Ligand binder design. Structure first.
Ligand SMILES: CCCCCCCCCCCCC/C=C\[C@H](O)[C@H](N)CO
Ligand SMILES: CCCCCCCCCCCCC/C=C\[C@H](O)[C@H](N)CO
Ligand SMILES: *C(=O)CCCCCCCCCCCCC
Ligand SMILES: *C(=O)CCCCCCCCCCCCC
Ligand SMILES: *C(=O)CCCCCCCCCCCCC
Lengths: 268, 283, 60, 5, 235, 235, 60, 151, 32, 60, 60, 5, 5
């Protein structure tokens, strides 16, 4: 635009929160569908829904992780990563049912002299593979759900050989996208790439996706966020560079049904 | 209104170019694929395109019966340490690999299911003897109905369960079933658990398998030889073929790249090297 | 109740048609019509918020 | 009676 | 009864047939669909999405993340190839596992134009010009820029538009090619060269990666459905 | 004769089929119907009739008249449950044998709203307030009024209108639930508490029974017909 | 003599119809149409002489 | 092992239809295939076999050819198969004009490879008059039944 | 004219209430 | 969708006709109509550039 | 921002209305009114502290 | 001839 | 309906 508007410079405002960026690579709307509230013709639970609106549909920043030459990748699940985030988390644990869309904003700046590229993927039903070759489908609820800290990918599959006290955790191998399919094909999922010379962030607007209009947020994650180094971090001639990666995520058009007493999960 | 059997777009003739229009240059970071066609980067002639994508419509891609299981039954005398063998199979497409991999190009699906049954029998013992033509009963028992415990017990009465009585040597049996899911679509992947572990509850009590939803998702097929036994032993097998008709699919996925290892997405050590050696600058 | 549709004829020896009658009350019993629609790949190939013009800079 | 496609 | 005469094909079971059959659950109350996002109508839609190529299948790089990275460096100009690839999208080991390659392995025949897009992942301070080439089959496969330039090509200038696309136009004798290695339906040669050289200032990495993607154009189609060799079930 | 080709399914006998067949008693003089009272057109009509719940299946009360009686008394207020029940209408032992439970055991799937009605059978002189609760699944099942109050509930004041109804609204993730015990399609928790306490004057019984009834609302339906486990025939 | 009725279509790939011809003189030989009616449950659920208004006291 | 059969689809293994088609250089047609199936006992013994079912699977160039009568490829999720019951009418299917050219070539005066000077003779070699090495694929046939004591 | 395959009644939206209308209170002795 | 054509009648006992209905979507499944055309042999019998008049000298 | 053009960074500027523990960690500050500032050519960034008060005027 | 339902 | 040849 001759008034200066740019593909690269954006402002997102949800609730009492605003994100600015000056080095964006446009932004993605997954499957071309913007988030929406549940329509009457698709509705299923009959009780009046709660719609917390600005109290929950706002940007929550998770703990910042660190990208280094040895990093194999990171993953998070939604809504799990937001289970402890203000009134969104509260609404989630107080209700049997809940649905939500999200704006995901991944942040990672560096310099004109650094290089590297992060693949940022939003995967519907991101089922990951377990650490076991003695029992399949054995990852425990506690290990499947890290909350905001997320998990990581590994370059090596290593089977849990403790049969007495199994680890019961995932063992997500990076080139196999943590799920037995090739990473080079993850681009069929809604994605952006943070290539440090080009941009310093990724923005993905995710609709609620499921085979149901609404479901148990506590039992089921709708989306997975997978961040993998497609091209490794590098800087000048330093052997041990580091740059931070920050995740900020906002729920959108979230509504809840089936109010009762609060859920108190076994998370450890 | 564009149909699957319509011809694809014609190539339009294009000549030399020298401008500020830059189709070839792009930025994959955006998450988009550059929509180019040959006339954007080379000189083209006019071609009237007749080819179509008719055979790769979702319906056409799936319009085939695939074997999902082999059930074994026999017609032997039940004796104190061993009974006449009837078969019980939990309905699924995950016991075999080929249809499973095709459905798993997608996250969710809706379809009407066509099941076709191929039935073959043979003698197992040496003796001369004979058997007369067998009739088979394929009974569907849905989650909650009494599963048969003996080849001849009351459950084979089927007052409400659907059964097929198939006569050996006649055309393979076939039935259709509608979209029977308890959700708006079948989930090929469920990133969740069927139970929330509560703190106030024992770990055992809150536990459940990762990625599993209803323990008896679709029920069972129970198959038996209806005939009484012969002096001679005859073993039979029922091969089940599944075809998804009237199908819709959502959310594409990368296909399975390493061997299947159970009903989930798990993989086995030693099978994780799909790709083969090939040098970067070797054609 | 007969449905008459046209065949797309490949090798040749007017429009040739074929006939179909549904014999059952349940639509699940029907054969597949194979009369399917196509859609544009955009939701997967161009899921970006701002419409892409291919001759223009993707980043401006 | 008849439908034509 | 109505006089009828049974014809050949009677009582067979063709797995590709399309007949009516009785419903085992009559009057079943079907759950309605809801408008789930991401519906697909044709497998070629998936073939038009860019997926990343495992170019470097060396013994130590294959089946690791490194296989997707093509290393460049600021070395003096050479006319020697950065990479060489056969246009056999279903059978060349670098293309057969891409989403396009995978879908093509469920079909016997393919036709249409393709496109390769490369992404430069060096620092902003790094500059360079590269030549991306497509040589239709029938001559010596290009091993020097001199030959590669004579075919279909794009000279890529590295800059703010991070990526560049070369379209491999449908140029074939036959109307469809086979999805296996076959000389009669061979597709030719894809290659990449240094046009000038990668140049960097001081305090900058002298080596970097480019990533490559392949996808189908809107004129691309497949036919004759078949089983793939890309999955099996021993025992 | 007319050329015909036999398709798969030929000569099978599907017990759920729906074909014509020859009549063994041609031109039989059928007796006309008369207008008998009580005609039923749909099994859900029966599911909408209230039937009484066998709540107290203790070892000594089960399979006796006592199983239908829930004993209350005029004891001091407590926040402890009078009764606790799982909303699994076909599989919980207290619901599975009600008329609703029985019909649901001939089907695989159920959906819709239900309602529980309680009848106070103490003397006219007895008063009291009770809290009837429905907690949708996913949290700790209520064992104290404190938790039960936070869910769907009705505070019942005992008086001339002898009975009170709590509607269990259809609140489910799935569009239909399974008619067996299943965690994925679990329905949650029904419970009853003392809100104040039962109070009686002198010369009055200090203990009494309440009876409970369950029935379906007009939005209730079932599907996928199946055999029941509630009857068998050994030998 | 063909009877043409519509199917209620569950999963999808206009109104789809199906055809039925009765081949026999006796109605007992016919298949079941499954075109059935529903009625209100009142004769069992509200068999009371005085019409019940649910918002009002059942006993007045 | 139990014997299953594999045949490269062609009209050139027999002579009569071949000679008729070869009155012409090129052709287009829809192909009708009909299958006649006959069985017999080979050993002397009395014994018996129950009625056999046969699987005729088409495997097109590129699909996994079966190595054993019972391996995973007979699953046929995408290849077309006919399951034929012994003693019923001969099996039959039609196939459209499936050529990768605008017509079938009964004669191809050429090679599938150009021998280049810069390449070894072995590397540029190919049979005279042959085009696609696996022109149309194979039919793989098996008896689906398990074995009898009698052959 | 209501057929067996007709959809059941819609749920109508309803809000808070404070009145002399008493749907919840009833009397099963009546037989209803 | 029925196609009604005439038979050419050889031995006799109006026009006699026969009926054909295509049962399948793919034209490849159809029977052969045998309703074929003839052409003149000229492209093989007289492929000469200058039209031949048979009463005239072929060489002039 | 008064660093060099070569310096980059993202900062979070926060406003927490009164009544809870004053934020000493980003975790708490993020939950209130805030702006995530990306450093670049637009040198400066503004957070608006919206009038959020119990009383109609505050004391000075 | 035909009846329509 | 019908075609005549
Ligand atoms: C007389 C024989 C009747 C046979 C009736 C079978 C009815 C049950 C059909 C179940 C449908 C299975 C569909 C496939 C599997 C699921 O889609 C996946 N696990 C995803 O949910
Ligand atoms: C279930 C059985 C399916 C069988 C399908 C067979 C499909 C393949 C048909 C190939 C067509 C062969 C036509 C004859 C040969 C060629 O015309 C000549 N070599 C000339 O090119
Ligand atoms: C619409 O169908 C009216 C025309 C009827 C044409 C002839 C029907 C052929 C036999 C149909 C049997 C129907 C199966 C229950
Ligand atoms: C009404 O039926 C007029 C139309 C007739 C349509 C074709 C009938 C198909 C064969 C019917 C046989 C009747 C059985 C005794
Ligand atoms: C045009 O076909 C309208 C007349 C229909 C005449 C009766 C058809 C007889 C049965 C046809 C079955 C079609 C096979 C899928």
């Amino acid at each position: 635009e001759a008034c200066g508007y740019s593909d690269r410079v954006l402002q997102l405002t949800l609730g009492n929160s605003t994100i600015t960026t000056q080095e964006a690579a446009n932004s993605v709307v997954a499957y071309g569908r913007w988030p929406e509230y549940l329509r009457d013709s698709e509705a299923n639970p009959v009780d009046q829904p709660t719609e917390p609106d600005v109290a929950a549909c706002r940007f929550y920043t998770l703990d910042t992780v660190s990208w280094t030459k040895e990093s194999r990748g990171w993953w998070w699940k939604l809504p799990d990563a937001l289970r402890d985030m203000g009134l969104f988390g509260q609404n989630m644990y107080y209700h049997y049912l809940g649905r939500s869309g999200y704006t995901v904003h991944v942040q990672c700046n560096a310099s004109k002299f650094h290089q590297g590229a992060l693949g940022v993927f939003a995967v519907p039903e991101m089922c990951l593979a377990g650490d076991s070759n003695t029992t399949t489908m054995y990852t425990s609820y506690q290990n499947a759900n890290p909350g905001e800290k997320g998990g990581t990918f590994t370059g090596t599959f290593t089977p849990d050989n403790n049969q007495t006290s199994p680890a019961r955790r995932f063992c997500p191998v990076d080139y196999l996208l943590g799920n037995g399919t090739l990473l080079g094909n993850a681009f069929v999922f809604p994605h952006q790439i943070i290539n440090l010379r080009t941009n310093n962030c990724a923005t993905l607007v995710l609709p609620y996706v499921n085979s149901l209009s609404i479901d148990s947020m506590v039992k089921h994650n709708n989306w997975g966020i997978a961040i993998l180094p497609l091209a490794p971090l590098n800087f000048a001639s330093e052997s041990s560079p580091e740059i931070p990666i920050t995740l900020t995520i906002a729920p959108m058009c979230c509504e809840f049904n089936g109010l009762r007493n609060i859920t108190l999960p076994r998370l450890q | 209104a564009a149909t699957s059997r319509d011809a694809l777009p014609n190539t339009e003739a294009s000549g030399p170019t020298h401008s500020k229009e830059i189709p070839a240059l792009t930025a994959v970071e955006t998450g988009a694929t550059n929509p180019l066609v040959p006339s954007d980067t080379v000189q083209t002639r006019h071609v009237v395109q007749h080819r179509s994508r008719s055979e790769s419509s979702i319906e056409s891609f799936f319009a085939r019966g695939a074997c999902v299981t082999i059930m074994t039954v026999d017609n032997s005398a039940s004796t104190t340490n061993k009974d006449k063998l009837f078969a019980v199979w939990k309905i699924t497409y995950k016991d075999t690999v080929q249809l499973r991999r095709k459905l798993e190009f997608f996250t969710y699906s809706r379809f009407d299911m066509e099941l076709t049954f191929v039935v073959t029998a043979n003698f197992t013992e040496t003796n001369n003897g004979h058997a007369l033509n067998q009739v088979y009963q394929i009974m569907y028992v849905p989650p909650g109905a009494p599963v048969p415990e003996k080849w001849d017990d009351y459950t084979w009465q089927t007052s409400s369960n659907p059964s097929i009585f198939y006569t050996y040597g006649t055309a393979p049996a076939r039935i259709s079933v509608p979209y029977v899911g308890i959700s708006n679509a079948y989930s090929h992947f469920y990133d969740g658990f069927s139970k929330v572990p509560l703190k106030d509850q024992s770990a055992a009590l809150g536990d459940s398998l990762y990625g599993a939803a209803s323990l008896n998702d679709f029920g069972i097929l129970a198959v038996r030889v209806v005939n009484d036994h012969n002096p001679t032993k005859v073993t039979s097998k029922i091969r089940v073929y599944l075809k998804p008709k009237h199908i819709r699919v959502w959310c594409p996925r990368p296909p399975r790249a390493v061997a299947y290892y159970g009903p989930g997405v798990d993989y086995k050590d030693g099978t994780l090297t799909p790709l083969s050696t090939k040098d970067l600058t070797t054609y | 109740g007969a449905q008459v549709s046209s065949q797309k004829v490949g090798a040749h020896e007017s429009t040739i048609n074929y006939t179909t009658i549904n014999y059952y009350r349940d639509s699940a019993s029907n054969a597949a019509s194979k009369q399917d629609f196509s859609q544009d790949p955009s939701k997967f190939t161009e899921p970006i918020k701002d419409v892409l013009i291919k001759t223009a800079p993707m980043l401006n | 009676g008849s439908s034509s496609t | 009864g109505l006089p009828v005469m049974n014809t050949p094909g009677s009582n067979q079971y063709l797995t590709a047939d399309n007949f009516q059959s009785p419903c085992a659950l009559p009057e079943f109350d079907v759950t309605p669909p809801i408008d789930i996002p991401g519906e697909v109508k044709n497998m070629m839609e998936l073939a038009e999405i860019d997926t990343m190529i495992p170019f470097d299948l060396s013994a130590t790089k294959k089946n690791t993340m490194e296989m997707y990275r093509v290393r460049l460096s600021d070395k003096p100009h050479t006319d020697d190839p950065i990479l060489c690839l056969s246009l056999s999208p279903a059978s060349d080991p670098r293309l057969s596992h891409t989403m396009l390659g995978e879908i093509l392995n469920y079909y016997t025949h393919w036709a249409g134009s393709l496109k390769f897009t490369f992404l430069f992942c060096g620092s902003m301070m790094a500059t360079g010009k590269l030549l991306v080439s497509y040589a239709p089959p029938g001559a010596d496969p290009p091993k020097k820029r001199k030959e590669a330039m004579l075919g279909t090509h794009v000279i890529w200038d590295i800059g703010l538009q991070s990526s560049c696309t070369m379209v491999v136009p449908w140029i074939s004798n036959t109307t469809y090619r086979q999805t296996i290695d076959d000389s009669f339906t061979e597709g030719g040669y894809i290659s990449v060269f240094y046009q000038t050289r990668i140049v960097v200032p001081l305090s900058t990495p002298r080596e970097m990666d480019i990533l490559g993607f392949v996808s189908a154009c809107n004129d691309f189609s497949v036919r004759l459905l078949r089983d793939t060799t890309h999955i099996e079930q021993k025992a």
